[PDB]
Design an enzyme around this catalytic site. Structure first.
Site, PDB file in Angstrom:
ATOM      1  N   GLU B  59     -10.508  -9.216   2.623  1.00 46.05           N
ATOM      2  CA  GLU B  59     -11.865  -8.128   2.534  1.00 46.05           C
ATOM      3  C   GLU B  59     -12.667  -7.865   1.152  1.00 46.05           C
ATOM      4  OE1 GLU B  59     -10.930  -3.768   2.109  1.00 46.05           O
ATOM      5  OE2 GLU B  59     -12.174  -3.140   3.833  1.00 46.05           O
ATOM      6  N   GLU B 136      -7.171  -1.139  -8.913  1.00 41.40           N
ATOM      7  CA  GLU B 136      -7.355  -0.064  -7.524  1.00 41.40           C
ATOM      8  C   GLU B 136      -6.125   0.311  -7.569  1.00 41.40           C
ATOM      9  OE1 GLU B 136      -6.886  -0.348  -4.231  1.00 41.40           O
ATOM     10  OE2 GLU B 136      -8.672   0.983  -3.799  1.00 41.40           O
TER      11      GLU B 136
END
Ligand SMILES: CCCCCCCCCCCCCCCCCC(=O)OC[C@H](COP(=O)([O-])OCC(O)COP(=O)([O-])OC[C@@H](COC(=O)CCCCCCCCCCCCCCCCC)OC(=O)CCCCCCCCCCCCCCCCC)OC(=O)CCCCCCCCCCCCCCCCC
Ligand SMILES: CCCCCCCCCCCCCCCCCC(=O)OC[C@H](COP(=O)([O-])OCC(O)COP(=O)([O-])OC[C@@H](COC(=O)CCCCCCCCCCCCCCCCC)OC(=O)CCCCCCCCCCCCCCCCC)OC(=O)CCCCCCCCCCCCCCCCC
Ligand SMILES: CCCCCCCCCCCCCCCCCC(=O)OC[C@H](COP(=O)(O)OCCN)OC(=O)CCCCCCCCCCCCCCCCC
Ligand SMILES: CCCCCCCCCCCCCCCCCC(=O)OC[C@H](COP(=O)(O)OCCN)OC(=O)CCCCCCCCCCCCCCCCC
Lengths: 74, 440
Positions: B59, B136
């Site tokens: 993604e 992240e």
């Protein structure tokens, strides 16, 4: 002294499982017996000697009482 | 306009199928905008423990560049036309929707045809994105809600691919190599498991022609998941530095189709959602909300119905201080059993109206409508019209709710995930005992 403020703990992860899914008697004899023997060996050395001393003094006392209540010097 | 007429007067979600198996769908109504997306049927559910997190990596790498659009050129196309490109990948779904103007729908489709089929997977970009993935993930550590939900998924579906997080373990993040990503994009992005959905002003014939002219050269015409198991357990991450303690409790819910979804969504609607920044406070019909506002024992709680294909999680998640978790659990369980044993008609009507408003208000704007189309074509296998939703809500009554909650809530081993000062949280035995009522 109730749940909520007993102490402070951090970075501890506890997993568990519903009692309705895991076995109530897991390896009760496969792992229970060797554990029992290990616990027995751990404490037998420090438990038995006082009681065998009792057994010794018991047998000696009863046999000496029996011997004393007898007939000899007459 | 008698409401039911409005539901009957909703444009139909026209759906067609290409030879490759692409499910093309559109809901052309009026707007000069549109959202066009390709809802993959991939995710962390279809990932082995070595491959965990590959979906997230794909993604991230999708929007960076393609062979036809090297790197920033792709971005140059999205921004210069005013389009907003976005992606989202849950445990069982993955989608890349490009919101755009209806006039430039052709180009967007071509653009989408680039992203999903012809990616780049550049090795230097792979390392640069690996570092971003790591930072992240460290960010998501701070997200208490996400962390607690991942804990719930780990403790509930333990030993199954459902337990695997979307991002994957931090070790994998470093160990993923370009071969794995190429295999994943060549094994889980196949044409049959694709849904090209477009909302807004998108004529269906134009969409079909664009798909046949851009998405034609795809896979022709097996990994199909394994039925996961529910394991009543709990994960308790006692950490007494976090100010609040997030707890999530869930039970095995229904399947994706599983018409029992409609009553349960009503039942959860009865519980409702409360937090500290609400309005009425000690006036909401929800007994939990009223009690929470009367005693301020709740900071923020809601009812979730995460529902996968073969199973799902149905429960509630609450955030409160350290000294109010037990009162929470008591009131939450008590209301659950109250609905279970005596649901009565009035709150059922309230839940029916609440669910009607949820479904109706959610389906506005091209992005939510397109998301509904893409998700419905994958999960239910069809776009359930709002008229059908109204019909399925209508016959739900007090007895139906009382029986479905009995079959899902009463005497069921739950899954608990607590994080923070969760010492006050009752042990698993008391929580499990809450799910049966001796007064019943
Ligand atoms: C007057 C005296 C009697 C009345 C008062 C009794 C008070 C205590 C009763 C309740 C109690 O403490 O129960 C738990 C207490 C200890 O835990 P447990 O119930 O054995 O559970 C497993 C242990 O946690 C862990 O034990 P383990 O790791 O050895 O594995 C299980 C099991 C292993 O058992 C075996 O291997 C079988 C050996 C034959 O251990 C045992 O000690 C067997 C107990 C039954 C015989 O129970 C017993 O010790 C047995 C009953 C209590 C009386 C002693 C009998 C000798
Ligand atoms: C008749 C069968 C029992 C029955 O229908 O109880 C309904 C009712 C309990 O309400 P429930 O909705 O079934 O249970 C949840 C409630 O929130 C009430 O429980 P909770 O959520 O506040 O706390 C959980 C837990 C906390 O534990 C207790 O409340 C008592 C636990 C006692 C355990 C034994 C050691 C102490 C003696 O409750 C219980 O274990 C059951 C409490 C009711 C029976 C207490 C008397 C037992 C005598 C033996 O019993 C009573 O209100 C007490 C009078 C009737 C039972 C005793 C005679
Ligand atoms: C050990 C020695 C005996 C101790 C006393 C046993 C009383 C009865 C206990 C019982 O209900 O089951 C005992 C034993 C194991 O039961 P459990 O651990 O639940 O595992 C089998 C079911 N899953 O299961 C059985 O004995 C039969 C189970 C069927
Ligand atoms: C003496 C009666 C038996 C006492 C020992 C057994 C026992 O306590 O069993 C649990 C029973 C029910 O209590 P509990 O399991 O906490 O569930 C409450 C409702 N959620 O606890 C009770 O107190 C129920 C006793 C029978 C009524």
């Amino acid at each position: 002294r109730e749940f909520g403020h007993l102490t402070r703990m951090r970075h501890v992860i506890t997993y568990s499982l519903s009692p309705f899914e895991q076995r109530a008697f897991p390896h009760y004899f496969t792992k229970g017996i060797p554990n029992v023997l290990r616990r027995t060996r751990a404490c037998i050395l420090r438990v038995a000697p006082p009681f065998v001393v009792f057994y010794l003094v018991y047998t000696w006392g009863t046999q000496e009482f029996e011997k004393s209540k007898r007939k000899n010097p007459a | 306009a008698t409401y039911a007429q409005a539901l009957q007067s909703v444009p139909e979600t026209q759906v067609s199928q290409l030879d490759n198996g692409l499910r093309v769908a559109s809901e052309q109504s009026s707007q000069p905008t549109c959202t066009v997306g390709v809802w993959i049927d991939a995710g962390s559910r279809y990932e082995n423990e070595k491959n965990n997190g590959a979906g997230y990596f794909v993604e991230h790498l999708a929007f960076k560049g393609t062979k036809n659009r090297p790197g920033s050129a792709l971005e140059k196309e999205v921004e210069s036309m005013g389009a907003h490109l976005n992606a989202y990948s849950t445990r069982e779904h993955t989608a890349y929707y490009i919101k755009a103007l209806s006039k430039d729908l052709p180009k967007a489709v071509e653009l989408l045809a680039d992203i999903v089929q012809n990616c780049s997977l550049e090795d230097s970009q792979i390392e640069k994105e690996r570092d971003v993935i790591l930072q992240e993930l460290q960010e998501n550590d701070s997200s208490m809600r996400d962390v607690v939900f991942d804990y719930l998924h780990a403790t509930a579906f333990q030993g199954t691919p459902l337990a695997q997080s979307v991002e994957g373990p931090s070790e994998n993040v470093r160990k993923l190599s370009r071969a794995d990503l190429t295999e994943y994009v060549s094994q889980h992005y196949k044409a049959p498991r694709m849904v090209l959905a477009a909302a807004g002003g998108v004529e269906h014939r134009q969409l079909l022609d664009l798909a046949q002219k851009h998405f034609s050269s795809l896979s022709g015409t097996v990994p199909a998941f394994t039925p996961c198991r529910f394991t009543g357990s709990e994960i308790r991450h006692r950490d007494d530095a976090l100010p609040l303690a997030h707890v999530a409790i869930a039970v095995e819910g229904p399947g994706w189709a599983n018409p029992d979804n409609v009553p349960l969504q009503v039942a959860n609607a009865i519980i409702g959602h409360y937090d500290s920044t609400y309005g009425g406070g000690t006036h909401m019909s929800s007994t939990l909300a009223s009690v929470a506002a009367t005693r301020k024992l709740c900071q923020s709680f809601q009812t979730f119905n995460i529902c996968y294909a073969e199973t799902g999680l149905l429960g509630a998640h609450f955030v409160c201080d350290n000294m109010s978790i037990d009162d929470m659990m008591f009131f939450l369980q008590g209301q659950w059993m109250r609905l279970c044993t005596s649901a009565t008609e009035s709150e059922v009507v309230r839940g029916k109206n609440i669910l009607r408003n949820a479904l109706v208000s959610h389906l506005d704007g091209t992005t939510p409508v397109c998301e509904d189309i893409g998700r419905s074509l994958l999960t239910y296998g069809r776009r359930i019209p709002l008229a059908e939703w109204e019909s399925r809500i209508a016959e739900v009554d007090a007895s139906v709710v009382r029986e479905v909650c009995s079959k899902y809530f009463y005497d069921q081993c739950p899954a608990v995930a607590g994080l923070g000062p969760i010492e006050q949280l009752p042990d698993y035995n008391r929580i499990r005992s809450g799910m049966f009522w001796l007064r019943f």
